[PDB]
Amino acid sequence: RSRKESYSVYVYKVLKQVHPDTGISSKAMGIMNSFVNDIFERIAGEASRLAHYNKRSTITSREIQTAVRLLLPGELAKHAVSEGTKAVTKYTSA
Amino acid sequence: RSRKESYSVYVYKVLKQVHPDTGISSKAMGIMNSFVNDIFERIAGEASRLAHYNKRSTITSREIQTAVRLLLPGELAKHAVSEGTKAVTKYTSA
Amino acid sequence: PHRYRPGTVALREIRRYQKSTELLIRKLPFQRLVREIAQDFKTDLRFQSSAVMALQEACEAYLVGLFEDTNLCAIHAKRVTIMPKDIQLARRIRGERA
Amino acid sequence: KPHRYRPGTVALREIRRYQKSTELLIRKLPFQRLVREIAQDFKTDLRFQSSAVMALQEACEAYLVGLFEDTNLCAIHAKRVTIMPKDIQLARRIRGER
Amino acid sequence: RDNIQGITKPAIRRLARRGGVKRISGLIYEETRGVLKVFLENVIRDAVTYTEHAKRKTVTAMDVVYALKRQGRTLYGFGG
Amino acid sequence: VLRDNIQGITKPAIRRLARRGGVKRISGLIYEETRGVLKVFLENVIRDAVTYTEHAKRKTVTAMDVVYALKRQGRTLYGFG
Amino acid sequence: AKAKTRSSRAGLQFPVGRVHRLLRKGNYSERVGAGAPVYLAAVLEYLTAEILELAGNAARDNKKTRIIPRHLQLAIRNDEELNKLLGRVTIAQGGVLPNIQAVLLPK
Amino acid sequence: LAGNAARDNKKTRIIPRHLQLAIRNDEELNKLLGRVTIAQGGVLPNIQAVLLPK
DNA sequence: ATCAATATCCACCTGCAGATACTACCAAAAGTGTATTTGGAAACTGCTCCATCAAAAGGCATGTTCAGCTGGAATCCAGCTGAACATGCCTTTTGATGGAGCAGTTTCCAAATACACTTTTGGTAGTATCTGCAGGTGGATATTGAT
């Protein structure tokens, strides 16, 4: 009884959102899982470093915002920052 | 007004061991501190990764040994491994 | 009899192999080479199939990138033939020799 | 009737002189003004420590020296001794910066 | 044990055609064989280190993925 | 404000930087080219540095921010901490 | 009772207790063994002694008695394994290695 | 991006080749993922101008 | 083969910034000693995937030939870069000043941890169903290359 968690169903939801009638193979889905894991580890490592530099003991939204700004370029950084900010305000105001 | 720890005195002891009558400037000592900190963080990060891969919760001597082997090349790896092993046996047998 | 001029089949092959995604080395020779190389670090190792597949993907990507760099170093000297000194320059600049 | 060195002599002498030394090769004040101008383009009303601008200077000089070495290699590859912009572009492309 | 001549000359020429090369010297084949053997032993050393640290005898795909990632050559697709 | 300071990197300074790199003969078009390169480099570091400074809610750029930026771009620097 | 420290127990010069504390506080794992700081201290001391011996030989070669960053750079760049361990670091006030291509020389 | 590539090659199902074509053809993605290898991805069709005939 | 003009190295000297050093102290830390808890080593076992043959079958590699075209060597020349001198200008050093911002001190309170409980829910395994696509076949045409 050994499981194996993955982001397959969430990637599938996003795909059905942006392309309602296109599918995806299994190897492309493995590529997408690898991509999500890689970017997650990058952002989390950078935020941990930022928290250590300032002698803080907590990872908050500002650490994630600054890590996003340090990692993504230009268009990507701007739009990701806007998306995350909107998400956090929508979450707290609910 | 808070103190600032460093490896100055230990580097000085090692120097007086290998070169009994040579001194060292202050900028070279800052270089040596930077070097020690950098190598320490490299080894410790690699050992942490190794411990996470095997779903272990403890950093032991084997993790440090494998990190040393993964980071240093050839001569350096061999001699560092021998030195650390001798140190650990000398420590436990005392 | 019909004969193409030297260089036509070359560009035809270039387009063909840049349109494709296959592997360009045979699998059994690469497997034997990998096992023989691993023979010196430890004896009696086993390999999953996906391990050798990953090794092959990585090696082919590396070599194709190196060949692009070599082609640039060749064109820089006003040639079209790649020579070993172009490979050596590309690797020296990348830092793989230095 | 006055003494003149042949072209390339003072250049080799200067090569030895500047490879034997460790000083900085850019004036401090122009570099500091340049750094402050760029920073102002990024965020207004900034301040700087002295060691920060010194670190920036050391890093930038090391970068440019390494780039010039790679450029020299690319130039010699083409059977020249004069470095030209296309060599800088080839070096920066093989390195992976453009 | 010439398993390095298993990488035939037409195979290297195919690899060169994919990289956009239009003409190939005759001394290129030995050079690429040397380069490839260097790269391969560099990767397999760390793969076998990762393996024997875990006290296993079978080299897994994840060991190769880690050995590649530590060289700065991340590889997507075999993360399972 | 201050504008047009890239010209303070004079031709003799670039010639010296090239001498330390082993370069014997220099084209006349190199200087301009070089300046561009340098500017790009600085803009990539200072930005990162400033991103650290605003994170701590500071207003002065310290040497540690520069060292962190250089390290995160793979250009580690020993001597300043 | 009488308290002898850990670095003396292991026969080292570097601090074992400080390395233990740095391994704990640095957030690397949730537990830390007893021999890990000893191993790490021994490795760090070995590397420092290696690089310092090379730098001192360089310094005594240039007829000086006190090491400066130039000597550290000359030691690092002249050894294969050190230069390949530290291939991507910049040493402030270090300079470069004297080296001119053969084709640029006269004759 | 990958779906646009897939629909461009008259297909209905994304494969790794389409992911590679999407990544390599965009500046910011190619510069974010500049050092990754996608298995079964291939390369971008591109021949130097000097190698063409005439 | 010679000579003469320039630049570099070395012996001598000295002023001074820097390394070595107590003294004090002092606060922060490392070591000892228990008690508790839990993660990891040993043992067993099941079952899955890796190594080894067997064995056609045909697609790819190898050796050979011929010829074309490319790389390299040799002249030749012009323009572009180096070397040197005169001028001036702007960087550097030293000192002083204002003062803005950083770092330490204290409060306190909003927010994150730790447990116990309950409800989904996403992931494995069959089990099943359907169909987008890779492989095969025919026919049009786009391109090359010698006349």
Numbering used by the authors:
A (entry chain h), B (entry chain d): 31 to 124
C (entry chain a): 38 to 135
D (entry chain e): 37 to 134
E (entry chain b): 23 to 102
F (entry chain f): 21 to 101
G (entry chain c): 12 to 118
H (entry chain g): 65 to 118
List sentences from the manuscript:
To explore its natural working mechanism, we assembled the Rpd3S complex with endogenous nucleosomes and resolved the cryo–electron microscopy (cryo-EM) structures in three distinct mononucleosome-bound states. In three nucleosome-bound states, the Rpd3S core exhibits three distinct orientations relative to the nucleosome, assisting the sector-shaped deacetylase Rpd3 to locate above the SHL5-6, SHL0-1, or SHL2-3, respectively. When superposed by the Rpd3S core, the nucleosome in state 2 or state 3 undergoes a rotation of ~140° clockwise or counterclockwise from state 1, respectively. In detail, the Sin3_HCR, Rco1′_NID and Rco1_NID bind at SHL5/4/2 in state 1, respectively (left); at SHL1/5/7 in state 2, respectively (middle); and at SHL2/7/1 in state 3, respectively (right). Instead, aided by the auxiliary subunits, the Rpd3 is located above SHL5-6, SHL0-1, or SHL2-3 in state 1, 2, or 3, respectively. Upon nucleosome superposition, the deacetylases in all states are located at the same plane 30 Å away from the nucleosome, potentially engaging in a revolving motion around the vertex of the sector. However, in states 2 and 3, the corresponding distance allows to bind with several lysine residues on H3 or H4 N-terminal tails (middle and right). Upon comparing the structures in three nucleosome-bound states, the rigid core of Rpd3S takes different orientations relative to nucleosome. It suggests that the Rpd3S complex facilitates the deacetylase in achieving the precise position relative to the nucleosome, thereby enabling it function at distinct deacetylation sites.
The Rpd3S complex plays a pivotal role in facilitating local histone deacetylation in the transcribed regions to suppress intragenic transcription initiation. Here, we present the cryo–electron microscopy structures of the budding yeast Rpd3S complex in both its apo and three nucleosome-bound states at atomic resolutions, revealing the exquisite architecture of Rpd3S to well accommodate a mononucleosome without linker DNA. The Rpd3S core, containing a Sin3 Lobe and two NB modules, is a rigid complex and provides three positive-charged anchors (Sin3_HCR and two Rco1_NIDs) to connect nucleosomal DNA. The Rpd3S core reveals a compact architecture composed of three modules: a Sin3 Lobe (Sin3 and Rpd3) and two modules involved in the nucleosome binding (named “NB1” and “NB2,” respectively).
